[PDB]
Design a protein around this ligand. Structure first.
Ligand SMILES: CCCCC/C=C/CC(C/C=C/CCCCC)(P(=O)(O)O)P(=O)(O)O
Ligand SMILES: CCCCC/C=C/CC(C/C=C/CCCCC)(P(=O)(O)O)P(=O)(O)O
Ligand SMILES: [Mg+2]
Lengths: 307, 315
């Protein structure tokens, strides 16, 4: 009867219950409490693409799974205690379950791609898009983490920083857009260059506000090669400002939560390298590239301000 | 206008990525490759192929896919298990850090995925292969999710033998079925599906892995990890059934210590030895599974194969 139960088990598909499904979904469901704005960007873009609502909703579900899962992983990789003022998933469910659940969701997302179309040519394209951007997202993340964890072995320049962003942040943006463009039953030049720009603006502003809001500035504690930090390191290098250059490095290397020390790094950025003003300006120019796109080379606005 | 011009160029092109960038993020992965077994996993594929007859070009690609998935799963697994060693060498996360190791492992899941396109140009087949890839990776993560949940939230859920076996069908069964199913789908030919057989192989493999981790010690790292192993699942249900309250609680207590103390680990092992007879039970359960194949004279499960089964511990 032992052998009989084994026969039954190996001839059936692996058993999995809704109760099991809920257990593994816990770390994921916790971050859901943190979507209205990203859905808006998708609805807006769909005016140019025109996917039928149902197909649109699946793209949205795919994009929500990747977004949320990648943030669960990112918070573990950044040792972040909070995400939108709430305790991070891994601190509640543990790093092990959270890594597994986030990765599980990548593949659930991958499965939804199959429900976008039954046309084999188009399907293959969609998987190829998914695959390529997840690959880019990972390269970008990998390089960002490498710079941070091997500091001070490599100090990126602005150009290296911008390529890392095109991979990382650009991956998620282009994935949503490229899927939508491949599905369009319609719509002008591709909006990829435009979504790339949005992604870059999004990341620099994210780096900028992390330091500006403090002026918690968790990016400092993390040791991240942020856009303002990249500017300051290369500024001090260039001007031969040895002590300042080394002091930025020292603070980043402390992995500090000390408010006083964080403020000091901010003092260097405000008074010595003027990196926060330089970033504010850099962002404004990226944005004016669109505000001033009268001939619609990028455009097919409100979203670019609430990015 | 030079900035705009550079920005315009940057955004109208694919993201820049160098071979140098590629080597820096491959560190955690290149490191686990320095571990053996590759030959043995290849040996199983080779033997299975005597049935499937995939051309060597294709078989090579199937093997690259499975190897990437295998090694990446292990990198993640060692982080999830807080493992300090793997095949006698330091785990990657301890060298390059957990952050880089998670990213790299996940990166390789997608490289493995990308490779599936190199198996065929036939779109219906392509669709079938990716579906197989997607399904078993979903199964693998479900199984791993349960194994980890049971362990990290113990005693919230004490799995029974049946729950354990289902978890294994999903987790270890996932990787064994992935390889086999890809091959069955690519076969140009050859008898009943080998899925039941490959599930049994995954099950013998897992319970034997659990078994040997304790028997070899009798470093029993599974005890330090607090894993709900086959012998541990038997012990916990055996003691509850027989009303051995103190022994049932002490097993849970030792698991929850996450201890490396050798005497404490030996104490737990000897409890399973003389008190619950979990080592004997497991050993016999393994032999019974193996006998289901060795006594498969009607080739119900079966299509060098037995050789594998005996050196299964080295895949
Ligand atoms: C392979 C994992 C990729 C994770 C990418 C996420 C990064 C998160 C950040 C912000 C990125 C947000 C991307 C939003 C994309 C919306 C579609 P954070 O500030 O929330 O930590 P950062 O670590 O790059 O700064
Ligand atoms: C999503 C990650 C799945 C990881 C599955 C791997 C588990 C590893 C083990 C062994 C599993 C091996 C899978 C079969 C390999 C066949 C070549 P270990 O002993 O190396 O830690 P276990 O945690 O199941 O015991
Ligand atoms: Mg094991």
């Amino acid at each position: 009867k032992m052998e009989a139960k084994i026969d039954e088990l190996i001839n059936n598909d692996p058993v999995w219950s809704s109760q099991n499904e809920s257990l593994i979904s816990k770390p994921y469901n916790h971050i859901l409490l943190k979507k209205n704005f990203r859905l808006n960007l998708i609805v807006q873009i769909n005016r140019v693409m025109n996917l039928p609502k149902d197909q649109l909703a699946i793209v949205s579900q795919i994009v929500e799974l990747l977004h949320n899962s990648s943030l669960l992983i990112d918070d573990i990789e950044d040792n972040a205690p909070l995400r939108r003022g709430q305790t991070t998933s891994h601190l509640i469910f543990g790093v092990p379950s959270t890594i597994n659940t986030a990765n599980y969701m990548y593949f659930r997302a991958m499965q939804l791609v199959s429900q976008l179309t039954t046309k084999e040519p188009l399907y293959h394209n969609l998987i190829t898009i998914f695959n390529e951007e997840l690959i880019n997202l990972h390269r970008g993340q990998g390089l960002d983490i490498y710079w941070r964890d091997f500091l001070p072995e490599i100090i990126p320049t602005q150009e290296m920083y911008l390529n890392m962003v095109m991979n990382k942040t650009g991956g998620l943006f282009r994935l949503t857009l490229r899927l939508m463009e491949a599905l369009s039953p319609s719509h002008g030049h591709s909006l990829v260059p435009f979504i790339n720009l949005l992604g870059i603006i999004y990341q620099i502003r994210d780096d900028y506000l992390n330091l500006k809001d403090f002026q918690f500035a968790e990016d400092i504690t993390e040791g991240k090669l942020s856009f303002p930090i990249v500017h300051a390191l290369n500024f001090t290098k260039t001007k031969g400002q040895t002590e300042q250059h080394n002091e930025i490095l020292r603070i980043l290397l402390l992995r500090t939560s000390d408010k006083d020390i964080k403020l000091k790094l901010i003092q260097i950025l405000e008074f010595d390298t003027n990196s926060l003003a330089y970033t504010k300006n850099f962002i404004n120019q990226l944005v004016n590239m669109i505000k001033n796109d009268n001939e619609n080379k990028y455009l097919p606005l409100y979203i670019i301000d609430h990015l």
